[PDB]
Amino acid sequence: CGRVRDFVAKLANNTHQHVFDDLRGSVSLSWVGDSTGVILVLTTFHVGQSKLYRSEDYGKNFKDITDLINNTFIRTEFGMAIGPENSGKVVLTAEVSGGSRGGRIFRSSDFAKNFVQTDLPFHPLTQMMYSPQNSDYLLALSTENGLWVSKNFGGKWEEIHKAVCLAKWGSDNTIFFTTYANGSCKADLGALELWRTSDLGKSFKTIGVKIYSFGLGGRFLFASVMADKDTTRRIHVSTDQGDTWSMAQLPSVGQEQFYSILAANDDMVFMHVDEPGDTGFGTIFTSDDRGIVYSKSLDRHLYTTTGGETDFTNVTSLRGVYITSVLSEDNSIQTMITFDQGGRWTHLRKPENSECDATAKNKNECSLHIHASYSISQKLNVPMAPLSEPNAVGIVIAHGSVGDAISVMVPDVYISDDGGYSWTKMLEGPHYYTILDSGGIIVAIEHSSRPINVIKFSTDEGQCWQTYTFTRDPIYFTGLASEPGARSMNISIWGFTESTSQWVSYTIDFKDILERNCEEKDYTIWLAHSTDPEDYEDGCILGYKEQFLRLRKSSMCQNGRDYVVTKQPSICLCSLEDFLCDFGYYRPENDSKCVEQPELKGHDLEFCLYGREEHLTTNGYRKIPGDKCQGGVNPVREVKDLKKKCTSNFLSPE
């Protein structure tokens, strides 16, 4: 089959141990900027003392800098507030004496090399929020519920507004916030006012009233608005930062239900709407590019309370792929996969050489099911949720169960190399997995009940493995650490020695395992989303194909830190399949044509009344958001006003 030679040597000298002398309590880990190797470990003990370690070599060596934080006690509730991109900004929130006028923070703007102790004119209630546009601009909520803003990275603060419940950093240093008038935040629930500040407190605009909550998603601003002399509430959307608002074409909810943004981007949002009264499920809706028109995408979508378990996963290694869990009528849980951004959802293909477990009503015919957030929450034997990396094309790794529903059995690990069209059992039993060098290295740690001393690796995308002993003295494993972006060749194995417990981190560099750097010949041409290769339209997802250049499973070379995923789009001809029904239109049975509804019912009728001209004047069809098809079919429809078909039945005044 093929394996790596003299590998023990290549890794032996590349295995860097480091012990953590004083360690117990809340033990945090933080990476500081890309391509820096900066790791910040922070431990807190309760009698009192706080330990702070720093690295500059991808966690191979740490240098105790507890001295830099003037040997004070840090409140892990706030954690290490790290600055965007490579700003190098780090904020630590220290525990102060009960009497104190305000809180105290430690700030570094040089990747934790030098810290500034800074006392504050208030006590923080929230972690400090860095501005996306300006890393030197911060905002925070006082314990007294006041909005404070720093224009100089924590040095100088000023209470820009008082009675606030929630504040968010928008695009280009703009802030949005909910403001209560009466008692508290919990008292004015659905009575709050939504405000905006373009100039950091200098000017304000009340962009909302009778607000339950608000949130940002891609290009949209959503806000649940409470009904007048009514218990219910509904979503309203604003593409212009609160200047104009349109009602969303979504159902309304009572006080016992919630709305959740499952995923949002520049084209659309996946919106979860809770089903009425303690169901433990809801319905997924996909939006239009305006965030106004909504297409029902998935029924009985498993999502617990607002807080807040769902198996909703974006399969980041391949475009338009998402996986989630649905509740079956017999109260069993099934995994569903979408390949066209929730257009159509279906079961996952069962790994060819895998057996149908006890959950299957058929010995030979069934599907793969995935363990995610929910399995974990129900204390199942799941050490890790699915993992996909945008730089490792088509790779998905997850804990599975082959059958008709999610088994409670001890799961094995499964791998897909084509973004979830086809799967194969990667490893037997639970494991901790990580992707390195954009899929050049796959790493695995066994999830055992007893100490471990070995690590497994694959240079052919989990098709062939090679066990290596990182330590003579085994450890009780906790987790892995690798630099966000899956580009390093460095991995930190964490755990503790068998007791008299001492924490350790064995970091391994795979520089000598993958000595040769990849070249043109190591890459092959791969069409994503291929289904029927003899078809002109094969691979068309959202109107276009993407033909990639992918690393050969056989090739055992290094992509490098500077690797660019290379693809080539091919613009397909529009079919009606590239359009979704606009307001008031529907798709009968199997047919792909959009016919007008005989008569609007439910939340559709509500919108037909309480909505605006633009959205109701259709245009039987609308192009799927993010759909880039050209040519072919264009359903050229005269923009017909529908606020006649609703009012048609209602007797109306003069």
Ligand X SMILES: CC(C)(C)c1cc(C(=O)O)n(Cc2ccccc2)n1
Ligand Y SMILES: *[C@@H]1O[C@H](CO)[C@@H](O[C@@H]2O[C@H](CO)[C@@H](O)[C@H](O)[C@H]2NC(C)=O)[C@H](O)[C@H]1NC(C)=O
**Subset of residues 268 to 307 that bind ligand Y, contact rule: CB under 6 A:** 270
Nearest C-alpha neighbor of 411 from the set 386, 435, 388: 386
**Subset of residues 319 to 358 that bind ligand Y, contact rule: CB under 6 A:** 319
Nearer to ligand Y, 320 or 611 (CB): 320
306 binds, among ligand X, ligand Y, none (CB under 5 to 8 A by kind): ligand X
Burial class (CB in 10 A: 0-12, 13-18, 19+), 19: exposed
Q: Give the residue, chosen from 29, 125, 191, 261, that forms a contact with ligand X under the rule CB under 6 A.
A: 261
CB of 338 to ligand Y, least distance (A): 11
Nearest C-alpha neighbor of 375 from the set 410, 345, 328, 337: 410
Binding characters for ligand Y, 477-516, by CB under 6 A (x = yes): -----------xxx------------------x-------
Cα 619 → chain centroid: 34
Check binding of 252 to ligand X (CB under 6 A).
no
Nearest C-alpha neighbor of 61 from the set 620, 519, 573, 490: 490
Size of the chain in residues: 654
- Tokens 């603060």 locate to 157
Dump the DSSP string for 431-442: EEEEEEGGGTEE
Nearest C-alpha neighbor of 234 from the set 216, 219, 206, 255: 255
Q: Residue 309, Cβ neighbours under 10 Å: how many?
A: 18
Nearer to ligand Y, 280 or 390 (CB): 390
Size of the site for ligand Y (CB under 6 A): 17
Nearer to ligand Y, 270 or 579 (CB): 270
Measured between alpha carbons, how far apart are the two ends of the chain, in Å?
83
539 binds, among ligand X, ligand Y, none (CB under 5 to 8 A by kind): none
540 binds, among ligand X, ligand Y, none (CB under 5 to 8 A by kind): none
**Of the ranges 114-122, 152-160, 216-224, 598-606, which one interacts with ligand X (CB under 6 A)?**
216-224
CA distances from 196 to 127, 130, 245 (A): 20, 17, 14
389 binds, among ligand Y, ligand X, none (CB under 5 to 8 A by kind): none
Check binding of 176 to ligand X (CB under 6 A).
no
Check binding of 212 to ligand X (CB under 6 A).
yes
Q: How far apart are CA 360 and CA 371, in angstroms?
A: 17
Check binding of 223 to ligand X (CB under 6 A).
yes
Nearer to ligand X, 168 or 553 (CB): 168
Check binding of 249 to ligand X (CB under 6 A).
no
Check binding of 185 to ligand X (CB under 6 A).
no
213 binds, among ligand Y, ligand X, none (CB under 5 to 8 A by kind): ligand X
Q: What are phi and psi of 494, to 5 degrees?
A: -105, 155
Check binding of 550 to ligand Y (CB under 6 A).
no
Check binding of 190 to ligand X (CB under 6 A).
no
* 176 within 8 A of 195, measured Cβ to Cβ: yes
Nearer to ligand Y, 138 or 263 (CB): 263
Chain interruptions in the chain, by residue before each (C–N > 2.5 Å): 47, 499
Check binding of 222 to ligand X (CB under 6 A).
yes
258 binds, among ligand Y, ligand X, none (CB under 5 to 8 A by kind): ligand X
Q: How far apart are CA 423 and CA 509, in angstroms?
A: 29
* 115 within 8 A of 107, measured Cβ to Cβ: yes
- Tokens 């010995």 locate to 363
**Of the ranges 43-51, 215-223, 549-557, 568-576, which one interacts with ligand X (CB under 6 A)?**
215-223
Cα 359 → chain centroid: 30
Q: How far apart are CA 177 and CA 165, in angstroms?
A: 7
Q: How far apart are CA 521 and CA 537, in angstroms?
A: 28
Size of the site for ligand X (CB under 6 A): 12
Nearer to ligand X, 222 or 270 (CB): 222
CB of 631 to ligand Y, least distance (A): 23
- Contact positions vs ligand Y (CB under 6 A): 37, 57-58, 60, 263-265, 270, 314, 316, 319, 390, 488-490, 509, 561
- Contact positions vs ligand X (CB under 6 A): 212-215, 222-224, 233, 258-259, 261, 306
